Each structure stands twice: as C-alpha cells, then as structure tokens.
C-alpha cells in the first residue's frame, strides 16, 4: 500500500491568506493525484486532480502542483468557506489510498484558558466512584497541556480529556480533563491539582483543593 | 445536482450485521465504480473496495473479505454495503462515492457518510452529578458551575441550563467512553452576583432510556 502523508493536522490561517498544504508519498506515483475538501458531516468534495487540475466548479483561487512523490494544495486568498478538512489521494495503482487530513482553522488573539476544578460529588460518592473534573475554557491557541498531582505528584492514569471543535462564533477551544478514581482510591489523598501550562502565561495555571477542608 | 444520499447512523450489537445504503440522484450509476471507504475517530480514510454496478463484479482490499458485502441496483440508482460479525473496530463512518468506470481513480462524487457505532452494552440512563465550588474564601468574580453526565449507553445525551434560558456562556464536550459506557460534563459559567442568589439547574435528557434528570446545583459539595 502507498502511504500519503500529511505532515500537518492542523493549520492556523486568515481570510486572505495564501495557503499551502503538503502531501508525501511513499513511492512515484506520478501526477495521478486528487485534492478533496470536506466539511463536519457532509460529502467529500473533488478540488483538484491530476495534481493540477482544477475540478470544474471549483473556485480559480485553488491550485495544487507537485509530481513523484511531493505534492501540495494551494489556496490563494483564502475565504471563510474554505475553513474545512483537506486531503489528497493517489490513484497510480491499488489499493487507492488517502492522506490522513489538514484542518484549516482560524487565527485570532491568544486567550488564556479559565481553569475550574471541581471534587467529587458525595452524590457519586455515595456509588463507590469518584470522578475529579477540570475545565479549561475559552483559550487560544489550541496546544496545551493538563497536569494532575494528587498530593504534589503526577498522576498518568485514570484521566481522561475531551476537547469541543474551535467555536464558530469567539474561534476559542475549550477542554475537560477528568481523573476517575474508585473511593477508597481517592479518599487515601488530600491534595488534587489541575495545572495547565499555555503560551499565555509563564506560570501554568494551577487550581485545586482538599479533601479534608470540602 | 449529482448527489449520493446515505442512509441514517446506526448503533448496533456487536456480533450483529447492518446493511448502509447509498442513493444516486441527478444522475446514473450504471457507468460508475461505486466505492466505499471507512473513517475510524482520529484515523484517516481506508479504502473498501468498489463495486461495478452494471455487472456487479465487486473488488474488496483483504482487510474486508468476508466483513463487507457490496451490492448494486442500477434500477433504483442504490448501493449498499453490509457489514457482518461487527465489532468495536469497526466503529466509523462510511462513504460510498463514484468515479467514472474508465477512470483510474478520482472521486468527483461523494456521500455525506453514515456513521455505524458498534458496542457489546445494553442501554443504560446516566448518573448525574452535580458540580459546585468548594467554599474557598479567595474572593473572584465569574463563577463556573458544572454536570457530569456518566455511564450511559448509546448516545447521546442533551443537556440545558435553566431549560434553555442560559445558553451563553456553557460548554457541552464530546462523550468518551470508560469501559463500554459514555461520560461527558458540562459547564456554565454565571456572573458571581447571580449564583447562588439566583438557581441555576442542568436539565440532562437520554432519549434512549426515556430519562429526564434535572439537578440544581447547590452551595458545598
């Protein structure tokens, strides 16, 4: 099998932008290659083909070049509809196969995540479990980081993270982190930490409390 | 325009079979491959196989012998593909789409995917916590309250602040799974002024199990 790489998941841009997405393949396969665009629950759609080509239909400001085994896919003043998933594909021999995806999203000012811990529940409790939840909302950019420390020292296991997609309204992320333990497991602890480290601030945002004070 | 209309999302028994559909509009598939390719969560697009409507020859890349079976019916414009002995695995969304019989390869017409989750669990209503402040005297304006929404099973759950009234400001993530049930929080956040003084209730729904839970999220723990 032929594997199409693409480097890059995702990939900041403004409207106006030129924009270029790269796509690898493990062998020569020529210029039989094809560009899609999709968008959240709709069809894939036919962009570019033959490395090249413009499908019909589609706007003259996408392009693409590149032959062998280097192929990319240029957008040239880039439009708030062109914010979608991109992916190439070879067609020069079986099976086809396809690039794992770009995502183009869109820039705007840094914000620094609100960070919110919350203990256990004696409603939860009460059922043998007890799940430590941290919210981190409303930041930019993306990459970010969540450390747990139950009483000063890191903990790997148990936490589990859920991230929404960038808002279509404020372009922010927001992101729950949650240490599940059993009862007894939590109840032998008294310190919980969620500690974020973002590029806007030099010292992570930490928030916690004790178990025998709440 | 020329269109491929896929059937509904399913949730089905592992161990179970499901047949996806995939209904040509504004145009013939006679003269088409019509493909198939599966999109696992977090994974990139893997090829099927295509079958050939017209004749109904079938071509399945050796990861899906015997799992999917491609058929055609150039009468009714549809393609379908069925999927057997599921599994967890093959929890992802599928694609049928078309390309020219002569063509070597590109895909012009695509569509809108089915998503197809496979579990082993039996429905099951969530448990929902409420998630208040501990009282540290530190003194702070805006104020995040929160519910979590745990051991659930299928999807999804919806959940509201004060029946809909507080929709700025609240953040509902995506479930994950913890052992074959579902958990996902939600968060809102208030003006300091205005919790406690004024209520504030996650109403949390899971149609599947005909459940409706509203907790009032109170001072403590």
């Known amino acids: 099998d032929i594997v199409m790489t693409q480097s890059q998941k995702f990939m900041s841009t403004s409207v106006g932008d030129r924009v270029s997405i790269t796509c690898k393949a493990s062998?020569?396969?020529?210029?039989?290659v094809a560009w899609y665009q999709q968008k959240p629950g709709q069809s894939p759609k036919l962009m570019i083909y033959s490395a090249s080509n413009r499908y019909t239909g589609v706007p003259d400001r996408f392009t693409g070049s590149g032959s062998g085994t280097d192929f990319t896919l240029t957008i040239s003043n880039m439009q708030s509809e062109d914010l979608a998933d991109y992916f190439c594909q070879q067609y020069s021999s079986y099976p086809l196969t396809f690039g794992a995806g770009t995502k183009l999203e869109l820039k705007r000012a840094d914000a620094a995540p609100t960070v919110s811990i919350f203990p256990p529940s004696s409603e939860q409790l009460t059922s043998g479990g007890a799940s430590v939840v941290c919210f981190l909302n409303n930041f930019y950019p993306k990459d970010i980081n969540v450390k747990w420390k139950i009483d000063g020292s890191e903990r790997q296991n148990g936490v589990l993270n859920s991230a929404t997609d960038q808002d279509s309204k404020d372009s922010t992320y927001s992101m729950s982190s949650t240490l599940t333990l059993t009862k007894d497991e939590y109840e032998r602890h008294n310190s919980y930490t969620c500690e974020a480290t973002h590029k806007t601030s030099t010292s992570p945002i930490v928030k916690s409390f004790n178990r025998n004070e709440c | 325009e020329v269109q491929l209309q896929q059937s509904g999302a399913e949730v089905v028994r592992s161990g179970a079979s499901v047949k996806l559909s995939c209904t040509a509009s504004?145009?013939?598939?006679?003269?088409?491959?019509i493909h198939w390719v599966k999109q696992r969560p977090e994974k990139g697009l893997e090829w099927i196989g295509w079958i050939d409507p017209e004749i109904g020859d079938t071509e399945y890349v050796p990861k899906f012998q015997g799992k999917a079976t491609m058929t055609a019916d150039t009468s009714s414009n549809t393609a379908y593909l069925q999927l057997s002995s599921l599994t967890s695995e093959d929890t992802a969304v599928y694609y049928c789409n078309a390309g020219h019989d002569y063509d070597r390869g590109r895909f012009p017409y695509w569509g809108q995917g089915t998503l197809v989750t496979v579990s082993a669990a039996k429905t099951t209503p969530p448990s929902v916590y409420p998630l208040a402040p501990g009282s540290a005297a530190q003194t702070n304006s805006m104020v995040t309250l929160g519910c979590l929404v745990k051991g659930y099973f299928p999807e999804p759950v919806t959940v509201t602040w004060n029946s809909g009234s507080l929709s700025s400001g609240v953040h509902t993530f995506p479930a994950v799974l913890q052992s074959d049930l579902y958990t996902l929080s939600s968060s809102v956040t208030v003006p300091s002024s205005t919790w406690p003084s004024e209520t504030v209730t996650c109403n949390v729904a899971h149609p599947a199990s005909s459940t409706k839970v509203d907790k009032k999220i109170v001072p403590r723990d």
């Open positions: 062998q020569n396969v020529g210029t039989a």
């Open positions: 504004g145009f013939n598939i006679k003269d088409y491959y």
